[PDB]
Design a protein around this ligand. Structure first.
Ligand SMILES: Nc1ncnc2c([C@@H]3N[C@H](CO)[C@@H](O)[C@H]3O)c[nH]c12
Ligand SMILES: Nc1ncnc2c([C@@H]3N[C@H](CO)[C@@H](O)[C@H]3O)c[nH]c12
Ligand SMILES: Nc1ncnc2c([C@@H]3N[C@H](CO)[C@@H](O)[C@H]3O)c[nH]c12
Ligand SMILES: Nc1ncnc2c([C@@H]3N[C@H](CO)[C@@H](O)[C@H]3O)c[nH]c12
Ligand SMILES: Nc1ncnc2c([C@@H]3N[C@H](CO)[C@@H](O)[C@H]3O)c[nH]c12
Ligand SMILES: Nc1ncnc2c([C@@H]3N[C@H](CO)[C@@H](O)[C@H]3O)c[nH]c12
Lengths: 224, 224, 230, 230, 235, 235
């Protein structure tokens, strides 16, 4: 019922986990949901609606990059009346004290122009919902997994011609880099809904985890 | 051998077709290649190396949006030594005289900041290779299929808050909108390689084809 | 010790509460701090150090606007070794469900200044309050039974904003409130690996014509939050 | 009929060849057009109409820079009903394989002007020559055995460019050459649903110190291309 | 009246001297205005109306940086009907032949704030002192007998400027000094039909400092106050 | 010498009058300079060196728009060692009390070109006329007995301006007129230590035109030429 989603109003749990990799969405179909009903495979995007400890979850891939996640997220909140999107994903460390760890974003800077286009060319600060951030932090806490908490940078360019930037992000204690959150968070605000992100280091840009990250995300889903 | 590509130097034909939809890459695996060898399924991205009329082709999905295609294309030209990328795809009409037709891009404007980042914040004109554009035009001509030739607009935002823009693109005779070419073309330039795009109207933003578009792209691949 | 501050090292506590009005700073020093010493009066800015429930605490004005709070915040984190600065201010409400004298706690702050674009290679820097501090303010307010909204704020360069359709747009994106300083504080604290946060009182609504108790309430939340952060 | 043009309707052919130097325009009128009538001399700009192999053709200067060619191109497409304007210019080569007096044909043109950002909601407008015309120029040059490179050009606002690392960057992206007008012509033609193209002669290399024949060669290619486009 | 000013139309004169430092406004009011009345002290900004050689004059602080002088300059012109604002403060040395305690008269000022871009469709607004005021200031400084350079200033949003190359660039283009308010004050005068000018004494030097003390920079810069008040008399 | 100028150091005087229209440079040279020598006519730009009341003067076209006056102003200051450039052209009426044939003296000029952003780290450069020249021009126009307004101009990159709201905005901020070269000419003088000023006569009006003919706008605007040459004498 949307150019990128065949599923119908109700086919989606009020809470969706989303990742970049569509095969990873399946992995957790599949490895945590009970009664994994496929609900979207347009563009092979692996949409599922299920339950975890009796609560209706969903998982789905979002594509690599802001423009992609901006498509999915807007559709989910608007059409499929989703209340909460948590991006579980991978990212690259900037902070010298973060290592191949779990990171929970409070916000995400960006080199994209998308937020300038939706905000009269001023600075929109892309902020994770304080609800969700707390939810993730807490869960991480119960399950006794260390998590870092802080800023992300959503890059439009995985191979960044602007090489002086990794260091500058370091200088300002940016935690890590990925390519989607700065797109998500303001869509969430726009629909009065909520979003958050987390959060695993799969490489360091200045020189188990899947399981931990997913238990935290799922435990957190529950509180929300 | 690249974070997004498991295949190896040689696994890719000097010429790759690429589309947004990874299931569509398969469709033409699959429907035109002979001896479809899978060469990449990281993130389910459907990479194939084959032959068409005895020439080594490849097909692959590129994701929706500049940041996505920028990842694939840069990797293909640099790592996998690809010489030519033709984006076969779908797009949305702006021009009042274009209808649910085939369009061949000579170039693509954009609301992305990616080209400003690679070009000292000046205007890079994202231009399809005149080679390829001619190749497509000619083929379209032999196979007796009408094609339109002209400008595209690569949007970062499928649901564009800036609603006055469809009309302004109309006023300047923009042909159609999609979300990838403006990312591609300058990468092509950067590696001294070549790229082009085309090209099918799947909706009009102001109010067979697959088969035709693919025969033109494949015929054209051959001349290149 | 700086062109804007005549204190020496040691003279400021590790936590400094700052507000725009230097006379409000003075009012706080006389009302909430015991044994307030005037440590800075350059430009009439009223900086004091004292204690609150045995814990060391400072208060100082910052003037109005990013440029001014940028001078004083960088000086504190850099010359004086401050660890934490909580803004205690007033703001104009935007979100239609926020009312005069309501109390807002900022997760982060948008801006129309060019300052962070200059600090950050012309990219979008998200000015975020430190997590600890947002939490401490939220805990304080719950312990004291003062209700507090949590959310994005917006720091404008222009109090009389000729961009008249901006208010609405912010509303559409659920910005709680507008003030004129947080977007500058946050990234400076990040730069000195220090902490910052901001708490405010709604003194007026920008979307439709609209005290002490409020001020008093915010001060308690800020001061108790300072205690927990120490 | 305009502040910059004293011709009336009818006075220009459907195809107008324009170059920066008004005396070059005059040189073209006297050398290639038969029965050249001076139709415009406001500001010394030298516009003529005549014929070439029985086909109607005009030539006029445009001055140096986007702003100037923007005045004259819009006036021609709008007041005079011109259908096609080919720039016939000189340029500085960039690409290391292009040499003095080589001939370049532009598929499109980058720019550092703000003009297209103003025309296009601050987005990236790709100034592209019309396909027909690029083709006609390429066909003409092949029929006449003059070799011609095809590629991106770049129109700078600043002949003496204080951005000294720009030349290299353009080279890295395989821009053929720099002139100071095409980026302005193309989008105006799009706006009047007309056609435009640009052909140039390399008068100098910007990447390392470096005639008539060349000029003559370009003129033939342009004039034959005009014939085919008619 | 305004949220930042508790006086009322009539309380301020038609000419107002302003500086960043309210304590320096207070020194001016005390050292030079016969019969100073405190007209406004919200935020401790020290606004006073008195008279100088028999003509009404006012003085008030404006705080540091564009956002702040913007708030006060616009209230003065709009609500309090002021006709002339002369800014008398400190810079900001860039020129190599200019030194601390030197005097500098701004014709205009560049900036790095988005403010003028925001009030002017994102183009380059020339923040320009009124020709009258420049001349007055220039005359006054020629009569009293004090040397003053005339030229351009630059209002920075960032006293601690991370762009460290910018100072040499300004030097190439021969800017005189750097401050933090004039680029905001001039387009506001333009917007209200009123006049504005800016005179400042050098308090440090950015290329080969050089310095100055909080006290001497608060009390030791009479002269600019002198030229400013003589200039005021004429206008 | 330069690619745009075939004269040589010495051929141009130290003061050059310039206008967009080379035919108007040629009228000035013919109507006013004793013993005009044609020093430069590459691109038909009409540069001449002669003398006026016994002082050396020069005159040359500069073409329309920032990119062009930029090319010539920089060659004059850099290679030909010029000391002063006075631009005498047309505008550009914005102010409602200004009308065709009226005279306008620019203190500075806003712009919408990226040029000043590019030579100034992307901030707001105040493109400012030299105070000397403004004064000279102002004096000359007071002596000869001709009325002239002093104020700000705006140099547009787009004579046909698609931003149709911009003219009223300029009006709010009281700009005098609109032209297409001054914002480029002033920072170049600054860069070379030299001086520049701009005087123009109103050739059309943007808010309630009003017009003028190619001929009267080419030949009928002596006066500005008069003030400019009197001003030149002083400088
Ligand atoms: N070093 C790094 N730079 C930028 N992005 C990432 C990522 C994330 N993984 C995908 C691209 O590899 C994309 O969806 C990002 O969110 C992992 N490592 C990264
Ligand atoms: N109306 C329209 N607006 C923008 N984009 C498109 C597209 C293309 N299809 C994908 C998104 O639906 C993406 O890869 C685009 O290239 C089709 N129709 C479009
Ligand atoms: N409605 C409103 N719009 C913008 N700013 C504010 C403020 C804050 N108070 C000072 C100026 O009023 C300044 O320091 C701002 O932080 C209070 N209400 C506001
Ligand atoms: N090296 C070079 N750099 C920039 N521009 C050019 C030109 C062109 N000739 C005129 C100025 O020289 C102007 O109209 C430009 O189009 C020729 N060579 C060039
Ligand atoms: N080096 C310098 N950089 C920037 N600004 C200044 C100033 C001016 N004095 C105040 C605080 O320094 C501020 O209001 C500025 O106007 C003096 N020296 C300066
Ligand atoms: N309405 C108007 N808009 C913009 N520019 C002008 C001019 C000036 N005259 C030349 C061509 O019109 C150009 O060189 C400008 O300097 C006169 N009237 C103007």
């Amino acid at each position: 019922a949307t150019p990128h989603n065949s599923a119908q109003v109700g086919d989606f749990a009020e809470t969706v986990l989303m990742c970049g990799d569509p095969l990873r969405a399946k992995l957790i179909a599949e490895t945590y949901l009970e009664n994994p009903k496929l609900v979207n495979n347009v563009r092979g995007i692996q949409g599922y609606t299920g339950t975890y400890k009796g609560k209706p979850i969903s998982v789905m891939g979002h594509g690599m990059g802001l423009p992609s996640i901006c498509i999915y997220a807007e559709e989910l909140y608007s059409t499929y009346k989703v209340k909460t999107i948590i991006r579980v994903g991978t990212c690259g460390a900037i902070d010298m004290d973060i290592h191949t760890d779990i990171v929970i974003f409070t916000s995400a800077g960006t080199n994209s122009k998308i937020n300038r286009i939706r905000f009269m060319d001023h600075d929109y600060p892309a902020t994770a919902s304080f609800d969700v951030v707390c939810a993730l932090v807490d869960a991480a806490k119960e399950l006794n997994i260390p998590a870092k908490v802080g800023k992300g940078f959503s890059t439009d360019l995985f191979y960044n011609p602007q090489t002086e930037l990794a260091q500058l992000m370091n200088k300002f204690h940016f935690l890590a880099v990925e390519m989607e959150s700065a797109g998500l968070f303001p869509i969430a605000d726009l629909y009065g809904a909520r979003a958050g992100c987390i959060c695993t280091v799969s490489d360091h840009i200045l020189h188990n985890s899947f399981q931990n990250m997913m238990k935290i995300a799922l435990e957190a889903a529950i509180k929300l």
